[PDB]
Amino acid sequence: EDRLQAVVLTDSYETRFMPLTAVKPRCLLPLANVPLIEYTLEFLAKAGVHEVFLICSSHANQINDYIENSKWNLPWSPFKITTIMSPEARCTGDVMRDLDNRGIITGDFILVSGDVLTNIDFSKMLEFHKKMHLQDKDHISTMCLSKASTYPKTRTIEPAAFVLDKSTSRCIYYQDLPLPSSREKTSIQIDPELLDNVDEFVIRNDLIDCRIDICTSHVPLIFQENFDYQSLRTDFVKGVISSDILGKHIYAYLTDEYAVRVESWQTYDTISQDFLGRWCYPLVLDSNIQDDQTYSYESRHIYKEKDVVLAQSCKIGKCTAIGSGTKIGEGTK
Amino acid sequence: FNITETYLRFLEEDTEMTMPIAAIEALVTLLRIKTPETAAEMINTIKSSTEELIKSIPNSVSLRAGCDIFMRFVLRNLHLYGDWENCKQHLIENGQLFVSRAKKSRNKIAEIGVDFIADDDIILVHGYSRAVFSLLNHAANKFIRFRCVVTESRPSKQGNQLYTLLEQKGIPVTLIVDSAVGAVIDKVDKVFVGAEGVAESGGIINLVGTYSVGVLAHNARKPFYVVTESHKFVRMFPLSSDDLPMAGPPLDFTRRTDDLEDALRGPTIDYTAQEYITALITDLGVLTPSAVSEELIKMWYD
């Protein structure tokens, strides 16, 4: 059960952020005055990772220097970081074949695309992955899911519809829809090959993507075998389901608690407002993870670090955070 | 050689040389002339000079308290039955070292007692002590947000004096009368006070309206503060609400007058009980309730 290795997909969703990612990398950008990688690394440490892998090509030098300065190059760290240097801008499938050629994957490995902040304990996830792997031999990868904000009417970038089992929690279909932004398409066609094998069909759009994966040793061998697969969700999951290799299973995990992957600007804005609020119970500014952080919680959701300078007769609002060594003038809201 | 005359010479000075610390320094100078080798010749003449000082006192309490601590230190010197000369040299030197300790204590408190004033808190300040104002100034030096409300105390007009000293710093203020002081306790976070003395019981010896402040704050449940330098402790136990050492009037009722001359007379110094004080601040740590008495028991060994 022990010894766990992780692979992080960086250089993945660049230029998806339109004005930025020009000089400095995607994941260097701060959410709450602290880099996005730091959140992911904290999730790795809480999960129990012994060996860390990172995928850097574009602005790779700045990433490597940041890891040099990081809290994990120091000997006491539970995990060690090794960077993968690849050709500039390639699909996830191409990187998977590169890693299989190098051959470091042992048993069960971890793959995360993008940077995700979640308060969900991973120890439960590992156990249920292992329990379901002991159920049948040909079982592959694990997917995370969380319940949405009642209706996803504001969420347009992630229109992923999931068809799931009530008994075994196996995914059946993945579909993207333009619906509310572009009223053009309405139809969704589903394969009727798995009708009586499941019986208890459950179709949901009210679930948020996470793109966090627990994967077996089968995965890198399949990527090299079928080099036509470029993506990991849109074509790959659907390809696995639609009788590519008969008798192969993939997991879908439901969790009540907060887990949202960063992808767009207006999603980033909501996650940030959720972090300022007490949505992520452990993940709060006051606990201080970067060690240099000296944030203190104040009532009405107001965050202030040490050495905060403020002018007299100034009003502060709700769900606000201010860094260290900061000066503010009069008449400010 | 005189001691009352030496204390009278401090007119335009003050501020740095605190009123008791200047009287203690005057006690050491009078000691070091006529040989501290003899304990019969010197101590008796020191006792006579303190008695002459008390007889010349109009409305001061702290000078009597400061004498006690001096005496105590003198007696404690040769408690090790040490050389009647190195013990003496250490006693004479502990006069300038006593005044130097007033600076070190102020350096301690102004970093400890800034913690009590939180993010954006409106303060109603009453009285004037060098410790409380030093907290107020070195919090402004710490760049912290606080509002200030001035109480119209009536001894030698202290409110106006306090208001002008707050203007020289750069902190927004307005005059509040001690009559209307009840109507302020809702827009005030915390109430602060500077004391003339702190009781054996745990109560306070203060100015022309401080008990009244203490009770109103107890009604409004809003905190009540006492901040001072640790030398204003007497073995005094004011048993009742209106009993204090006085040279002038303990409430006098005058006859029928037409020219209007005999009027003013009211209790200029008033006591408040132990229950009304929420917090007390000195250089001797952060302590309030039974702490004062334990200090006095430790000193007096009785």
Curated annotation (Swiss-Prot), chain A:
Q: Which domain of life is it from?
A: Eukaryota
Q: Where in the cell is it found?
A: Cytoplasm, Cytosol
- Similarity field: Belongs to the eIF-2B gamma/epsilon subunits family.
Q: What else is known?
A: Present with 33800 molecules/cell in log phase SD medium.
Q: Give the function comment from the record.
A: Acts as a catalytic component of the translation initiation factor 2B (eIF2B) complex, which catalyzes the exchange of GDP for GTP on eukaryotic initiation factor 2 (eIF2) and is regulated by phosphorylated eIF2. Its guanine nucleotide exchange factor activity is repressed when bound to eIF2 complex phosphorylated on the alpha subunit, thereby limiting the amount of methionyl-initiator methionine tRNA available to the ribosome and consequently global translation is repressed.
Quaternary structure, from the entry: Component of the translation initiation factor 2B (eIF2B) complex which is a heterodecamer of two sets of five different subunits: alpha, beta, gamma, delta and epsilon. Subunits alpha, beta and delta comprise a regulatory subcomplex and subunits epsilon and gamma comprise a catalytic subcomplex. Within the complex, the hexameric regulatory complex resides at the center, with the two heterodimeric catalytic subcomplexes bound on opposite sides.
Q: What is this protein called?
A: Translation initiation factor eIF2B subunit epsilon
Q: What is the lineage of its organism?
A: Eukaryota, Fungi, Dikarya, Ascomycota, Saccharomycotina
The encoding gene: GCD6
Curated annotation (Swiss-Prot), chain B:
Which InterPro entries does this UniProt record tie to the protein? Answer: eIF2B_alpha/beta/delta, elF-2B_alpha_N, IF-2B-related, IF_2B-like_C, NagB/RpiA_transferase-like
Tell me which UniProt keywords the record has, alphabetically.
Acetylation, Activator, Cytoplasm, Initiation factor, Phosphoprotein, Protein biosynthesis, Repressor, Translation regulation
Which Pfam families does the UniProt record give? IF-2B
Q: Which GO terms describe its biological process?
A: cytoplasmic translational initiation; positive regulation of cellular response to amino acid starvation; positive regulation of cellular response to heat; positive regulation of translational initiation; regulation of translational initiation; translational initiation
Taxonomically, the superkingdom here is: Eukaryota
Mind listing the GO molecular function terms for this protein?
A: enzyme regulator activity; translation initiation factor activity
Q: Which residues form the signal peptide?
A: none
Q: What happens when the gene is disrupted?
A: Inhibits GCN4 derepression in glucose, amino acid, or purine-starved cells.
- Taking the first listed entry, what is the main subcellular location of this protein, grouped into a coarse class? cytoplasm
Subcellular localization is given as: Cytoplasm, Cytosol
The chain residues annotated with the modification Phosphothreonine are T288
Q: Could you name the Gene Ontology cellular component terms for this entry?
A: cytosol; eukaryotic translation initiation factor 2B complex; guanyl-nucleotide exchange factor complex
Reported function: Acts as a component of the translation initiation factor 2B (eIF2B) complex, which catalyzes the exchange of GDP for GTP on the eukaryotic initiation factor 2 (eIF2) complex gamma subunit. Its guanine nucleotide exchange factor activity is repressed when bound to eIF2 complex phosphorylated on the alpha subunit, thereby limiting the amount of methionyl-initiator methionine tRNA available to the ribosome and consequently global translation is repressed.
What extra comment accompanies this record? Present with 8970 molecules/cell in log phase SD medium.
Q: Which family does it belong to?
A: Belongs to the eIF-2B alpha/beta/delta subunits family.
- List, alphabetically, the PANTHER family matched: TRANSLATION INITIATION FACTOR EIF-2B SUBUNIT ALPHA
State whether it acts alone or in a complex, and with which partners, per the record. Answer: Component of the translation initiation factor 2B (eIF2B) complex which is a heterodecamer of two sets of five different subunits: alpha, beta, gamma, delta and epsilon. Subunits alpha, beta and delta comprise a regulatory subcomplex and subunits epsilon and gamma comprise a catalytic subcomplex. Within the complex, the hexameric regulatory complex resides at the center, with the two heterodimeric catalytic subcomplexes bound on opposite sides.
Q: What is this protein called?
A: Translation initiation factor eIF2B subunit alpha
